[PDB]
Amino acid sequence: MFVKQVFFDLGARIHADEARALVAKLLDDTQPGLVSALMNYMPASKTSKTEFPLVQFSNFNQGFALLGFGEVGAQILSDATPIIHDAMAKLFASRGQGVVVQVSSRDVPLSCEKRPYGLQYTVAKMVVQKKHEHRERLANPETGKVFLEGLFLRSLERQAAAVGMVLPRDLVVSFKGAERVSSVKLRPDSTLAHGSLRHAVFEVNARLGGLWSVGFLLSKGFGHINTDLQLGQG
DNA sequence: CATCAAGCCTTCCTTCAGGTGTTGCTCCAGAAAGGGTGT
């Protein structure tokens, strides 16, 4: 259907995972149901859900941003916005002179159509390795290529299934190359790290008309970009 | 290339003129009786 994008401006850039950690800490004391819905927690305990994250953070040049996929995530985002905005207002008025928190909103629709010609899409900060077997597949390009093709196709399929719209199942994908290889950290000052691709280029015969999320670590603002910008971006 | 506004308001009838004159029925619904005249 549609995905709603909420932009939060504080005058300074904070990273999406750091904003996720910061957002949880300020509201930990009060209103726990709002935090449970925002982070996609299970309704009983603190453990997050296994399924597709409806609410995820993203990147914003002067702050961070929220993505709510579908009507449920849009409603969760709709009820979350004033409490979170007041939380940054009190947090940034507690210290310093004070800064005006500035909000923005968009309701981006989602669409997909199959075309008989290849189309190019580039994704930045792409996490691909999460067990040892995926590290073994990444050593040889032939057996890592088909793994990446299946990962991209299953990512598109699970996002189409979670948003509630039908995706044609005759899509063919192709992967050209990635600019860099870098690690990501789950928590700061932790020895554990996950391998990741940087500026990866993919080619799909079909076209996409909105925000699309691919791969793992979707709730940390990793590996989603606006396709509607990328039609004819060059 | 996608949203982002994607109207608000308040007006939202007013006054008389809102007939006048005239027509407003007529007539006949008998049948001898005394004269003619025409076949």
CA dihedral angle for residue A12, residue A186, residue A66, residue A233, rounded to 10 degrees = 80
Largest interatomic CA distance in chain A: 58
Å from A48 (CA) to B15 (C1')?
A: 79
Which of A84, A100, A83 lies closest to A92, judged by CA?
A100
Q: Which nucleotide is nearest to A106 (CA to C1')?
A: B3
Nearest-angstrom CA–CA distance, A202 and A185:
25
Q: Which nucleotide is nearest to A107 (CA to C1')?
A: B3
Q: Structure resolution in Å?
A: 2.8
Å from A191 (CA) to B2 (C1')?
A: 40
Q: At what angle do helices A70-94 and A32-39 cross, to 10 degrees?
A: 120
Tell me if A184 sits within 8 A of A126, measured CB to CB: no
H-type alpha helices, A40-178: 70-94, 132-137, 141-163
Tell me if A103 sits within 8 A of A86, measured CB to CB: no
Using what technique was this structure determined?
A: cryo-EM
Size of chain A in residues: 234
Nearest-angstrom CA–CA distance, A85 and A138:
42
Q: Which nucleotide is nearest to A5 (CA to C1')?
A: B3
Nearest-angstrom CA–CA distance, A74 and A208:
20
Q: 3-state class of A63 per DSSP?
A: strand
Which of A38, A65, A43 lies closest to A53, judged by CA?
A38
Å from A218 (CA) to B17 (C1')?
A: 82
- Can you name the residues that pair with A102 across neighbouring β-strands? A9
Backbone dihedral region for residue A232 (phi beyond 0: left; psi -120 to 50: alpha; all else: beta): left
Tell me if A56 sits within 8 A of A67, measured CB to CB: yes
- What is the token pair recorded at A226? 């606006």
A26 burial type by CB count under 10 A (0-12 exposed, 13-18 middle, 19+ buried): middle
Q: Strand B: which bases are under 7 Å from protein Cβ?
A: 1-6
* Cβ neighbours of residue A41 closer than 8 Å, sequence gap 6 or more: A35, A47, A48, A49
CA dist A109 to A1, A2, A69, A128, A209, Å? 6, 4, 10, 27, 7
